[PDB]
Amino acid sequence: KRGHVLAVPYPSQGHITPFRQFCKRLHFKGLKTTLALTTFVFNSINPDLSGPISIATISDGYDHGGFETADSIDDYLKDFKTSGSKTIADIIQKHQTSDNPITCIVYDAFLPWALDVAREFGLVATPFFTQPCAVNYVYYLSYINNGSLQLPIEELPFLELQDLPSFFSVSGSYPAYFEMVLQQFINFEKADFVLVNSFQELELHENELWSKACPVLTIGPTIPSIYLDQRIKSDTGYDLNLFESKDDSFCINWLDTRPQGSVVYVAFGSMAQLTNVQMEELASAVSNFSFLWVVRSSEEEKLPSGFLETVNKEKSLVLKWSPQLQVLSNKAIGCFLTHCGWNSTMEALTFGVPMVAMPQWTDQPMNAKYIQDVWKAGVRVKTEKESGIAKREEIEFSIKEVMEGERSKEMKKNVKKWRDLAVKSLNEGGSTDTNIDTFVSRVQ
Ligand SMILES: O=c1ccn([C@@H]2O[C@H](COP(=O)(O)OP(=O)(O)O)[C@@H](O)[C@H]2O)c(=O)[nH]1
Ligand SMILES: *[C@@H]1O[C@H](CO)[C@@H](O)[C@H](O[C@@H]2O[C@H](CO)[C@@H](O)[C@H](O)[C@H]2O)[C@H]1O
Ligand SMILES: *[C@@H]1O[C@H](CO)[C@@H](O)[C@H](O)[C@H]1O
Ligand SMILES: O=C(O)c1ccccc1Br
């Protein structure tokens, strides 16, 4: 009972969620955990503090208004390094005289400066990569190559330019985040372990390639236990949400009244923004089906005028935010039109829902390539090259290709094999269970 982990996610939904889920595993194994949330995020969730994972607050330098009040991404990340370094040190010091001092920092691999704080206080230090091995390996190769990548890549020859992360195909875009994803490897060989939110059996070739450069421990998937191994009965869903849902039994009740495999689920995660024109083609494309579509509140203005009040409430429904895990488990869902964020992708792969891949940026084009051509669990929509948008009739074709045809009945079979491989990996003796045990043993 001696070890104590301070877990520091990048302050966004797709990073806080896998960090918290991993903390629930550690707690089940006997390791005490504290999750470090920025003050802005903490005051937005109003979290329920009566739980097995304690909460501490740190600062990114934007306590009042968070990221949207920062001038720029580069200013945000530099100020987060400054204030985050000092406020993470504050938590360590405040726990020094306690019953269980902090002994280990699990920090988002996006924040390599947290290793320096852990090492200053003599702690165990492990970066946590929330993206899959193939993506991280691609970034590692570019980092070794002064931030460039010459295709073809010898060990992954099937990768074309349109499959690499967006920073390689959109020249000069988001230079501060490009630098961030490359500099995850600036010091990662000096950490006690390298953790990755994937499971070995999902990416055998890339895991072993990446491991040759630096030993990594796959510890995923971070899907709640009740849906897979079921050894942690208290782990029944995601319990830290940065977004309000109107208490959606509304959503699951409605899905129950629908025929099996009849609903197209459409969701673009917590972050990605679609243009006016993109929303136009999407709304026209999906209105050919029975659909459940998350349109985040900030995105509604880009819907075509009068769209919300012309959805027929017998076949279709539009939400501000969904209980995605419950949606993807419900049998009324025929396919998942997704931006190919890594958590959404892994959730779809484990629940056996075939995907229509509509990647937008960052690692999403990589996940899309793996969804279609490696795991063969869905189809990527084609975007015209001069314009860069996917029009309504290609989107509609891609959804049909996954709902009905001969291509359809193949991809349903393939995607159903991943759930068992994940349950095997999380159960006693599995790949991920063994790696989590290795980490827990070191921490204490
Ligand atoms: O309406 C929604 C949309 C997304 N999610 C959850 O939000 C996370 C999105 O993370 P992902 O890595 O897919 O995308 P990002 O948001 O990081 O771009 C996932 O855990 C989803 O299950 C949800 O609960 N409801
Ligand atoms: C990274 O930069 C992009 C803009 O290019 C921001 O969207 C992102 O900010 C995130 O925004 C989410 C809401 O859409 C917040 O939930 C999240 O906390 C915040 O980090 C930047 O991270
Ligand atoms: C950065 O750019 C992409 C568009 O390519 C968008 O999806 C994000 O919302 C934005 O932050
Ligand atoms: O890749 C991601 O998921 C990501 C998430 C949040 C902020 C920046 C990035 Br580059």
Swiss-Prot record:
Keywords: Glycosyltransferase, Transferase
Keyword Glycosyltransferase: yes
Summary of the tissues where the protein is detected: Expressed in seedlings.
Top-level division of the source organism's lineage: Eukaryota
InterPro entries the UniProt entry points to: UDP_glucos_trans, UDP_glycos_trans_CS
Disulfide bond entries: none
Chain positions recorded as UDP-alpha-D-glucose binding sites: 270, 322-324, 339-347, 361-364
Keyword Metal-binding: no
One Pfam match: UDPGT
Gene Ontology molecular function terms on file: benzoic acid glucosyltransferase activity; nicotinate-O-glucosyltransferase activity; salicylic acid glucosyltransferase (ester-forming) activity; salicylic acid glucosyltransferase (glucoside-forming) activity; UDP-glucose:4-aminobenzoate acylglucosyltransferase activity; UDP-glucosyltransferase activity
GO biological process: benzoate metabolic process; para-aminobenzoic acid metabolic process; positive regulation of seed germination; salicylic acid metabolic process
Entry EC no(s): 2.4.1.-
Induction behaviour: By auxin, abscisic acid, salicylic acid and the bacterial pathogen P.syringae.
GO cellular component: cytosol
Function description: Glycosyltransferase that glucosylates benzoic acid and derivatives. Substrate preference is benzoic acid > salicylic acid (SA) > 3-hydroxybenzoic acid > 4-hydroxybenzoic acid. Catalyzes the formation of both SA 2-O-beta-D-glucoside (SAG) and SA glucose ester (SGE). Has high affinity for the tryptophan precursor anthranilate. Catalyzes the formation of anthranilate glucose ester. Is the major source of this activity in the plant.
Note: Plants overexpressing UGT74F2 show increased susceptibility to the bacterial pathogen P.syringae and reduced accumulation of free SA upon infection.
Official protein name in the record: UDP-glycosyltransferase 74F2
